[PDB]
Amino acid sequence: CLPNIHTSNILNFTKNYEIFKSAKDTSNFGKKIILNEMQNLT
Amino acid sequence: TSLDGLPETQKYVYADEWGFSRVGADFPPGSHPSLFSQLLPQALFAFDARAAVAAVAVPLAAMAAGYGWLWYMHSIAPVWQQALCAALIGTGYAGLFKVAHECAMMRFIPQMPGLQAALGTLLMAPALYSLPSWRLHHLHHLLHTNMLWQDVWGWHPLTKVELADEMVRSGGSGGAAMAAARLVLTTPIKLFASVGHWLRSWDGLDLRHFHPASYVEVLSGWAAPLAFAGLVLPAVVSAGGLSGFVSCYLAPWLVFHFWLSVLSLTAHTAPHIPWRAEGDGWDAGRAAVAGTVTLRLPRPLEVLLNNANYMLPQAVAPGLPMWSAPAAYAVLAARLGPYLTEASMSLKLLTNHVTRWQIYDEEAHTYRPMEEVVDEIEADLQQLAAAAQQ
Ligand SMILES: CC(C)CCC[C@@H](C)[C@H]1CC[C@H]2[C@@H]3CC=C4C[C@@H](OC(=O)CCC(=O)O)CC[C@]4(C)[C@H]3CC[C@]12C
Numbered sequence A: 001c002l003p004n005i006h007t008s009n010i011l012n013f014t015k016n017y018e019i020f021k022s023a024k025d026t027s028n029f030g031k032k033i034i035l036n037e038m039q040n041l042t
Numbered sequence B: 001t002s003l004d005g006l007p008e009t010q011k012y013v014y015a016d017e018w019g020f021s022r023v024g025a026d027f028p029p030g031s032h033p034s035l036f037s038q039l040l041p042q043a044l045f046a047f048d049a050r051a052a053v054a055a056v057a058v059p060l061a062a063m064a065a066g067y068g069w070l071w072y073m074h075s076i077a078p079v080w081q082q083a084l085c086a087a088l089i090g091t092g093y094a095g096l097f098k099v100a101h102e103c104a105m106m107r108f109i110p111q112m113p114g115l116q117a118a119l120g121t122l123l124m125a126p127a128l129y130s131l132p133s134w135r136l137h138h139l140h141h142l143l144h145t146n147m148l149w150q151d152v153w154g155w156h157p158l159t160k161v162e163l164a165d166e167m168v169r170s171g172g173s174g175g176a177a178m179a180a181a182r183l184v185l186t187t188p189i190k191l192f193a194s195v196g197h198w199l200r201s202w203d204g205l206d207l208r209h210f211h212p213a214s215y216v217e218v219l220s221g222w223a224a225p226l227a228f229a230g231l232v233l234p235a236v237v238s239a240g241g242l243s244g245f246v247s248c249y250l251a252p253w254l255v256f257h258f259w260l261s262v263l264s265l266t267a268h269t270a271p272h273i274p275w276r277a278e279g280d281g282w283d284a285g286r287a288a289v290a291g292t293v294t295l296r297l298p299r300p301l302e303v304l305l306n307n308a309n310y311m312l313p314q315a316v317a318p319g320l321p322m323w324s325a326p327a328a329y330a331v332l333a334a335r336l337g338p339y340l341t342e343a344s345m346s347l348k349l350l351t352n353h354v355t356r357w358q359i360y361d362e363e364a365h366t367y368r369p370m371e372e373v374v375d376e377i378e379a380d381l382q383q384l385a386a387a388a389q390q
Helices: A012-023 B008-018 B049-072 B079-104 B114-126 B131-143 B161-172 B176-186 B188-191 B196-201 B214-247 B250-268 B283-288 B299-304 B325-339 B347-355 B372-385
Strands: B294-296 B342-346 B359-361 B366-368
Touching: B008 B114, B049 B079, B049 B214, B049 B299, B079 B114, B079 B131, B079 B250, B079 B299, B114 B214, B131 B214, B161 B176, B161 B372, B176 B188, B176 B372, B188 B250, B188 B294, B188 B347, B196 B250, B214 B250, B250 B294, B250 B347, B283 B325, B359 B372, B366 B372
Parallel strands: B294 B342
Antiparallel strands: B359 B366
């Protein structure tokens, strides 16, 4: 069988979200050093 | 204000007993140490290139002359010639270090903030000092000047109730702590106690003492010192051996630390200056102007150390440049003459700092000798034991 996903709404968002996340690694933990440079007396 | 208003005759005999050139007048509460900055002319905050380049290149030339003289006769020199070269190089470096301490407070060349921060870092490196920790500690000093339990980045005096507490906590004066305190505050090694201050920087090498948005700046601040003691200190040893290290590095280091320690110790310690805890009678302008001392130098030493003894002209005006620190003092005595305090270079003053003014008592609000204080609190232990036999 099949659950006929296109006439749903939770399946729509969960589907698009999982596809987007699986496309490519888009986590960036190394862009937060800018947060450790906000008070500089230079 | 401890020995405040009474006839000037006894304050003058006190000034002669202590080697002081003056004792202050009465200061009333409710003032701001920034007030009297309104008096100085609008040209005392001026910028000029020649004075600054002289202030940086004169002690440089002193140090260079000393090194050249030494490397001319690297290790065949006798002991007192070595001492002369060490003293000369240490004095030149104290001058360069005052230039550093100027650019740390951003008042040396505000035109180029980056160049001046780099200069301060470079000149602080050879002494193993981090620029931002120094700046934080100095502002924290200015804010709590002469406050009890609060200014630990100055010459915080040792009080009486705490020493009795430690007396009981060690079970007598025979533990390591009491002996250490005695030996450090009784012999001329006190004149080098600034070394301990250098070990209280590097706050455990711990970023948990600071504000997160500053981490990347604090670490770089700990980098220039470390890198130095990681790159240059080996090279020297490699090319000079142990002795060749005790000569070209360690002795000018002890000289600079002597100069630093004595400058601070004589600038903010005196028997006519009380140390109040705030709430129990503290005030900003009072503990700033009334609880201070200014020292006199020979003009050669004053052009070498770069006005290293004028600490009040830049405590009333935190943005006052360095080549104007004497001139500004010229104005201040014109206005607050009776309240100022002054002193001169004298081994008698240092000897009284070493032997007489050792322990601060808050009852008489003044400094006392350590052996008398220690015998008398032993006598108070006898008293409380007499109250305890039953
Ligand atoms: C060996 C010389 C010739 C080169 C320069 C060495 C310095 C960079 C070293 C030597 C002494 C070190 C200090 C010795 C003791 C301490 C305490 C230590 O921290 C703690 O003990 C944490 C607090 C605690 O335990 O209560 C580490 C930092 C610090 C300041 C050290 C920082 C690095 C210092 C200044």
